[PDB]
Design an enzyme around this catalytic site. Structure first.
Site, mmCIF file in Angstrom:
data_model
loop_
_atom_site.group_PDB
_atom_site.id
_atom_site.type_symbol
_atom_site.label_atom_id
_atom_site.label_comp_id
_atom_site.label_asym_id
_atom_site.label_seq_id
_atom_site.Cartn_x
_atom_site.Cartn_y
_atom_site.Cartn_z
ATOM 1 N N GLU A 162 0.799 -1.247 0.000
ATOM 2 C CA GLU A 162 0.000 0.000 0.000
ATOM 3 C C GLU A 162 0.828 1.293 0.000
ATOM 4 O O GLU A 162 1.843 1.377 0.627
ATOM 5 C CB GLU A 162 -1.011 -0.022 1.161
ATOM 6 C CG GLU A 162 -1.961 -1.232 1.153
ATOM 7 C CD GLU A 162 -2.954 -1.203 -0.020
ATOM 8 O OE1 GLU A 162 -3.394 -0.108 -0.415
ATOM 9 O OE2 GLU A 162 -3.325 -2.267 -0.578
ATOM 10 N N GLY B 182 -3.420 4.605 -2.456
ATOM 11 C CA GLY B 182 -3.775 3.432 -3.263
ATOM 12 C C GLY B 182 -2.813 2.256 -3.166
ATOM 13 O O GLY B 182 -1.809 2.304 -2.446
ATOM 14 N N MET B 183 -3.133 1.190 -3.899
ATOM 15 C CA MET B 183 -2.214 0.082 -4.028
ATOM 16 C C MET B 183 -1.013 0.363 -4.951
ATOM 17 O O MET B 183 -1.054 1.228 -5.848
ATOM 18 C CB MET B 183 -2.931 -1.177 -4.466
ATOM 19 C CG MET B 183 -3.450 -1.177 -5.861
ATOM 20 S SD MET B 183 -4.468 -2.673 -6.219
ATOM 21 C CE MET B 183 -5.231 -2.800 -4.589
ATOM 22 N N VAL B 184 0.066 -0.353 -4.663
ATOM 23 C CA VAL B 184 1.187 -0.425 -5.527
ATOM 24 C C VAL B 184 1.310 -1.813 -6.170
ATOM 25 O O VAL B 184 1.166 -2.839 -5.502
ATOM 26 C CB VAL B 184 2.436 -0.091 -4.787
ATOM 27 C CG1 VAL B 184 3.555 0.069 -5.772
ATOM 28 C CG2 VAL B 184 2.194 1.131 -4.088
ATOM 29 N N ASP C 5 10.090 13.389 5.887
ATOM 30 C CA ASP C 5 9.718 12.041 6.280
ATOM 31 C C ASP C 5 10.830 11.100 5.959
ATOM 32 O O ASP C 5 10.558 9.994 5.482
ATOM 33 C CB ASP C 5 8.471 11.590 5.547
ATOM 34 C CG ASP C 5 7.746 10.408 6.251
ATOM 35 O OD1 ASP C 5 7.949 10.159 7.479
ATOM 36 O OD2 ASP C 5 6.949 9.704 5.565
#
Lengths: 122, 359
Positions: free
Chosen positions: B32, B36-38, B148
């Protein structure tokens, strides 16, 4: 030693591992090494179902940890609105300050979360 | 008697659409992202597998800004230790566009995963640190803050190339303007969050990135996060638990008076000596670590000085550590706009990857 196992599962969004521990008489207000309860952890991670059954099994909704941090503060910091609503519905004090002097309201002003602010005024 | 033409499928994955057109095939779910999904896919033009992330940000203003910033920064950036964008796929028209797919180099592994299974050789800790700072030099020279850095945003391949990724939390802060009070308040992943972020609220600077690199080095030395706080107050706790209580000078540099007041409310704490924590660590590494994990962001080492530190002498080559030629400027920071307008901006930035685009 159930409390411990229940702490570790409220953290991890284990909806079922939590439901079972409850049914084995796990202490709902199990305290961790820092004064954090299962409600703290589930509200921090936005795990709504879990918050809700912890309340139903008697979870102290205004529990303070050794930092004066309450479940409400934690739901507020990550902007978990649903959970915030439910904590209020169950009587969390909106005026609770952590030992830094912050309230769940201050947090919402600090994060510019306009939606969370209205919720705390109603 | 109607052309029973049968073309059908958008490819599906875990029940969601993954529509990466005829160029990307052989999909494989690989976890994730933020919105969205990868999937990893085979790039039928470049003949290699790539990583494709599906993004669906259009409902929420802040998803839009974060997506737009990642796109505009990475499309302008060009550096070996920073992930690129290879392609961007979306609908031909702004109404049809609900999703955006960003295509990038596929990297075998990353440092978070490496640290879970591997005690790094000192050669590895070193060469990895060199590459984090080299990429960071460039990021910073662009007037960008990453905000980050942490092991799982440091991608890795088997020749030990290291690339910094995930710029959704990144931002420009052009220093010709004053940003005190303008910066978003709750940034960086907790364990990697510089003390000033929870202390000089909305007044931090690109040195928060240095603090994170500090935490990463400490992590590479012992395979354990150095400051695993449970919440903001406990995070502060874990830092002062090792740096010790802040000095009187340092304290009188806390801008925010409520923070200062709180710092005074705390029992004294002794500094814990670096080699007490890391008795096996190379002592020059420990010197650099001290410099980066400096409580006061003003005394904290900067990227170009960290590269020059004795620990990295084997790799340090200023002529081979490029900066951004066109640094970003204040006007690119103005993305406080309606989600609809941000969508138009995303639409116009991604045009240049649409089939047939000319120029």
């Amino acid at each position: 030693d159930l409390g411990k196992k229940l702490l570790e599962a409220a953290r991890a969004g284990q909806d079922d591992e939590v439901r079972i521990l409850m049914a084995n008489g796990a202490d709902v207000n199990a305290l961790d090494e820092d004064g954090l309860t299962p409600l703290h952890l589930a509200a921090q991670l936005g795990h709504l179902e879990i918050v809700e059954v912890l309340l139903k099994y008697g979870a102290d909704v205004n529990a303070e940890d050794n930092f004066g941090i309450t479940p409400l503060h934690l739901a507020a910091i990550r902007g978990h609105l649903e959970i915030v609503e439910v904590l209020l519905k169950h009587g969390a004090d909106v005026n609770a300050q952590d030992k830094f002097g912050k309230t769940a309201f201050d947090i919402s002003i600090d994060n510019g979360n306009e939606d969370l602010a209205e919720i705390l005024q109603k | 008697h109607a052309m029973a033409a049968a073309a059908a499928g958008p490819e599906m994955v875990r029940g969601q659409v993954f529509d990466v057109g005829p160029r990307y095939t052989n999909l494989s779910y690989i976890g994730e992202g933020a919105y969205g999904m990868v999937c990893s896919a085979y790039d039928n033009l470049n003949k290699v597998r790539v990583a494709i992330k599906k993004i669906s940000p259009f409902e929420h203003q802040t998803y839009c800004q974060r997506t737009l910033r990642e796109i505009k920064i990475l499309l302008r950036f060009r550096h070996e230790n920073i992930i690129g964008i290879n392609d961007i796929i979306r609908a031909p028209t702004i109404e049809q566009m609900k999703d955006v797919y960003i295509v990038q180099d596929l990297m075998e592994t990353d440092l978070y995963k490496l640290l879970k299974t591997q005690h790094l050789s000192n050669d590895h800790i070193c060469y990895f640190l060199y590459q984090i700072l080299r990429g960071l030099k460039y990021i910073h020279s662009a007037n960008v803050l990453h905000r980050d850095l942490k092991p799982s945003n440091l991608l890795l391949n088997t020749t030990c190339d290291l690339k910094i990724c995930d710029f959704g939390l990144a931002r420009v802060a052009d220093p010709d303007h004053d940003h005190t009070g303008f910066l978003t308040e709750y940034v960086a992943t907790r364990w990697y969050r510089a003390p000033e972020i929870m202390l000089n609220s909305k007044g931090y600077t690109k040195s928060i990135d240095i603090w994170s690199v500090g935490c990463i080095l400490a992590e590479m030395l012992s395979n354990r996060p150095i400051f695993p706080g449970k919440h903001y107050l406990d995070q502060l706790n874990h830092i002062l638990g090792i740096l010790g209580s802040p000095s009187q000078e340092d304290l009188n540099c806390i801008i925010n008076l409520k923070a200062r007041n709180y710092l005074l409310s705390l029992p004294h704490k002794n500094k814990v000596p670096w080699n007490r924590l890391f008795p096996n660590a190379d002592s020059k590494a420990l010197d650099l670590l001290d410099k980066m994990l400096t409580f006061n962001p003003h005394k904290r080492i900067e990227v170009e000085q960290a590269l020059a530190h004795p620990y990295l002498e084997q790799y340090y080559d200023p002529s081979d550590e490029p900066i951004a030629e066109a640094p970003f400027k204040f006007d690119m920071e103005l993305d406080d706009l309606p989600k609809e307008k941000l969508k138009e901006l995303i639409f116009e930035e991604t045009a240049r990857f649409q089939p047939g685009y000319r120029s």
